[PDB]
Amino acid sequence: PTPVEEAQQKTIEAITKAINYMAKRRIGALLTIERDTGMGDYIETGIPLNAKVSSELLINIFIPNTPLHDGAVIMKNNEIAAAACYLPLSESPFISKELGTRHRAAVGISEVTDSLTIIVSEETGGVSVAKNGDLHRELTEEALKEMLEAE
Amino acid sequence: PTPVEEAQQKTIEAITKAINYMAKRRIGALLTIERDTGMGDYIETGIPLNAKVSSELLINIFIPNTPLHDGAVIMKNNEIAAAACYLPLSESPFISKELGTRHRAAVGISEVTDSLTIIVSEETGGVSVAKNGDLHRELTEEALKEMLEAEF
Ligand SMILES: COc1ccnc(NN)n1
Numbered sequence: 001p002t003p004v005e006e007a008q009q010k011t012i013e014a015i016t017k018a019i020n021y022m023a024k025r026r027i028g029a030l031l032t033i034e035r036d037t038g039m040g041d042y043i044e045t046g047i048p049l050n051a052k053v054s055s056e057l058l059i060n061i062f063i064p065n066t067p068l069h070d071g072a073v074i075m076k077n078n079e080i081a082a083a084a085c086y087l088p089l090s091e092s093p094f095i096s097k098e099l100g101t102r103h104r105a106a107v108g109i110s111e112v113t114d115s116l117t118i119i120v121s122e123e124t125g126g127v128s129v130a131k132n133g134d135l136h137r138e139l140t141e142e143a144l145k146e147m148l149e150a151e
Numbered sequence: 152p153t154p155v156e157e158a159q160q161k162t163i164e165a166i167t168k169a170i171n172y173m174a175k176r177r178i179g180a181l182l183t184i185e186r187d188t189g190m191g192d193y194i195e196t197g198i199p200l201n202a203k204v205s206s207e208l209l210i211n212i213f214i215p216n217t218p219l220h221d222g223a224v225i226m227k228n229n230e231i232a233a234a235a236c237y238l239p240l241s242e243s244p245f246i247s248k249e250l251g252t253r254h255r256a257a258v259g260i261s262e263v264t265d266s267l268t269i270i271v272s273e274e275t276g277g278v279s280v281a282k283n284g285d286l287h288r289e290l291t292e293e294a295l296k297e298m299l300e301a302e303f
């Protein structure tokens with residue numbers, strides 16, 4: 001593997017470790033990975049970080065009742081660009097009616113960008129991914145890894 | 152003021168806001184500001200962040216029972232270089248006997264660098280600074296801000 005490929009794999013590993021920790025503890029989380037569609041306007045609504053990715057930093061960001069947990073982390077160029085960012089809420093009538101604004105925000109950004117967003121539910125610890133306007137629910141760890149590698 | 156001066160003032164405002172929040176809630180914290188003596192050897196022992204400073208990130212780092220809360224945050228100019236860093240423990244007899252590892256680590260790094268370290272006690276909420284081998288305890292918010300402004 002090249003240094004770029006090793007860097008992507010290390011980032012995937014950091015993401016999945018953090019997601020698993022939060023799912024176990026039913027900590028709500030919202031993590032959007034910018035792709036070809038720029039999301040600077042949304043990044044600018046949050047707290048700037050421009051931080052190296054680590055599972056530890058991701059977990060510390062989403063701790064309940066802390067400054068940085070309310071909103072979305074947005075990742076760009078293999079770094080955490082900002083935390084506590086605003087995402088647009090989807091008006092789609094085809095999202096499961098039991099879900100709240102976290103999932104609607106993930107679907108909403110997925111409607112107007114090619115980004116991939118990961119959501120951890122605070123009600124169940126379930127893990128889902130929003131892309132292209134659809135929400136993929138009740139993912140296993142292997143399913144999430146496959147989506148991150150495919151992306 | 153120059154951009155460098157404005158950035159310094161922003162970083163001091165972020166630090167003081169974080170320390171004040173943590174002091175009020177008895178959140179233990181250990182925050183070393185690198186000066187002219189390079190601290191790379193200690194930065195390398197922690198989790199790399201290389202992150203822009205904010206009061207919100209500093210507070211989130213030290214929340215008890217989280218991955219990044221144990222060990223020192225080391226700041227380099229206007230960045231949080233790393234968290235959960237090791238610092239050497241001082242054996243100075245002028246550290247109050249009731250104080251724990253955070254204060255001893257702060258004095259310890261202050262004996263081998265020109266850095267300024269801020270400590271929040273999880274027992275009392277009191278704020279102290281370690282510099283040049285000396286620990287100064289029970290600082291007011293004004294005293295801390297003045298110390299930080301004088302450092303730059
Ligand atoms: C890290 O990926 C995932 C997905 C679904 N559940 C979990 N852990 N309970 N991890």
Ligand SMILES: [Mg+2]
Nearest residue numbers: 287288289290
């Ligand atoms: Mg006194």
